[PDB]
Amino acid sequence: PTKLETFPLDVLVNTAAEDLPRGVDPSRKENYLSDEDFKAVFGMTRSAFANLPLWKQQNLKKEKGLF
Template identity: 50%
Template sequence: MLLDAWRVVFVWVGAQSRREERELAERTALEYLATDPAGRGADTPVVRVRQAGEPPTFTGFFGAWDDALWESEPDWEAVRRSVATDNRGVRQVLAASSAQPLPTYPLAALNVREPDRLPADVDPAVKERHLAPEEFQQVFGMTPEAFGALPAWKRQQLKKQVGLF
């Protein structure tokens, strides 16, 4: 996971992550900074933080940080269930699948770096959502649902490969 704290970008690494995932996460953080529209880059530090060894400079960004969380909740699914239980007053009002469909555009119309050159109703952060399902399949080699199930870092990498980041 990446946490952009403006003056520093943290790469949080889970205890069960593989070496290639850790290296890829760090490269993704560097690419993220290199493509930052605000112009940050080489002088912004990227700090790797390991699970269960988070410093106060990292945990301070999370008001309800619990150092013992992973002792009582051994995996992500258990954490997800716990968060849902602890936040019973919060519920999703409109499921993404029931929302109005977004207008679609060809890849060429979305494959621009300057946000002001995009169609007015396109969010530059999620350009891929404006591809027609058939073109999405052709561009990414998978369905939008399969793409959405990928980790965020992997989706970002794929978007960069096709010029949608």
């Protein structure tokens, strides 16, 4: 698919789901973080995160306000 746009961490954490930017899926907020923000928040590669069990992906996001 088309490369996703990048959005600041605070926009993703503070904006209600229905108020988010066009193209932004609130169930996949981590995919819109810049590489710098993703690395800082999750401390692992995107592929590594995507390969984790769903419960773990969700739990890590919950502790960061990204779920």
